[PDB]
């Protein structure tokens, strides 16, 4: 429906295809049932739209498209009643494209955008889905329990085994990423340390 979302999908489908780490993770079913989205705006959206420093190589289209459908997105508010403050809540940017709260439905995958501004810590978090982080724009640090950290640029990617604690920290750069889920799509991410860290 909303042509913002229309263009987005199409930018999704084509990158998926061009990118082995995506196409290797999940097959695109081709073949997604449309569903209405109730818009929710949050300040992070503003942030994403505004950020002058979401730099790329090969991934401007999708990026722009992510931005464009931002106006119509269901912005999420995961971590709501946690230990995380508005500091977090008003900076951490996420919406659904494929799945719950997104314009398209699927039993096989979900797809998302993550934005984070500079000077932010995304604390250690976890979920049942298997995960891929494909970076579109800027750069950030990726954290994963028991592995050395990785600085992630564009077209870089990280795999998250099930339940595996992972974190992100931005320094002076922002980033945007495509995030794909497979497996248990229904269980929302939770903080690994709801009281600490
Ligand atoms: Fe995750």
UniProtKB/Swiss-Prot annotation:
Consequence of gene loss (knockout): Decreased dimethylsulfoniopropionate (DMSP) catabolism.
Assembly behavior: Homodimer.
Documented EC number(s): 4.4.1.3
Molecular function in Gene Ontology: dimethylpropiothetin dethiomethylase activity; metal ion binding
Species assigned in the record: Ruegeria pomeroyi (strain ATCC 700808 / DSM 15171 / DSS-3) (Silicibacter pomeroyi)
SUPFAM superfamilies: RmlC-like cupins
Family listed: Belongs to the non-heme iron-dependent dioxygenase family.
This protein's record includes keyword Lyase: yes
Reactions mediated catalytically: S,S-dimethyl-beta-propiothetin = acrylate + dimethyl sulfide + H(+)
Co-factor: note: Zn(2+) probably constitutes the cofactor in vivo.
Residues annotated for a divalent metal cation binding in this entry: 127, 131, 133, 166
Required cofactor(s): a divalent metal cation
Protein name per the record: Dimethylsulfoniopropionate lyase DddQ
Keywords associated with the record: Lyase, Metal-binding
Enzyme class, UniProt record, top EC level: lyase
Functional description taken from the UniProt entry: May act as a dimethylsulfoniopropionate (DMSP) in vitro, releasing dimethyl sulfide (DMS). DMS is the principal form by which sulfur is transported from oceans to the atmosphere. The real activity of the protein is however subject to debate and it is unclear whether it constitutes a real dimethylsulfoniopropionate lyase in vivo.
């Amino acid at each position: 429906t909303d042509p913002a979302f229309q263009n987005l999908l199409a930018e999704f489908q084509a990158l998926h295809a061009r990118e082995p780490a995506l196409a290797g993770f999940v097959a695109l079913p081709d073949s997604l049932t449309p569903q209405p989205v109730t818009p929710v705006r949050i300040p992070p959206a503003a942030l994403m739209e505004s950020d002058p420093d979401l730099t790329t190589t090969a991934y401007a289209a999708i990026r722009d498209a992510f931005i464009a459908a931002g106006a119509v997105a269901q912005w999420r508010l995961t971590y709501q009643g946690s230990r995380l403050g508005a500091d977090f809540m008003d900076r951490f940017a996420c919406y659904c494209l494929i799945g719950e709260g997104g314009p398209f439905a699927s039993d096989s995958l979900a797809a998302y955008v993550v934005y984070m501004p500079a000077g932010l810590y995304y604390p250690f978090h976890q979920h049942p889905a298997e995960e891929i982080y494909f970076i579109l724009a800027g750069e950030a640090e990726f954290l994963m329990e028991g592995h050395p950290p990785r600085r992630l640029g564009p077209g870089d990617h990280v795999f998250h085994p099930s339940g595996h604690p992972h974190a992100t920290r931005t320094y002076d750069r922002p980033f945007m990423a495509l995030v794909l889920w497979r497996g248990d799509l229904e269980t929302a991410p939770v903080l690994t340390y709801p009281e600490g860290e």
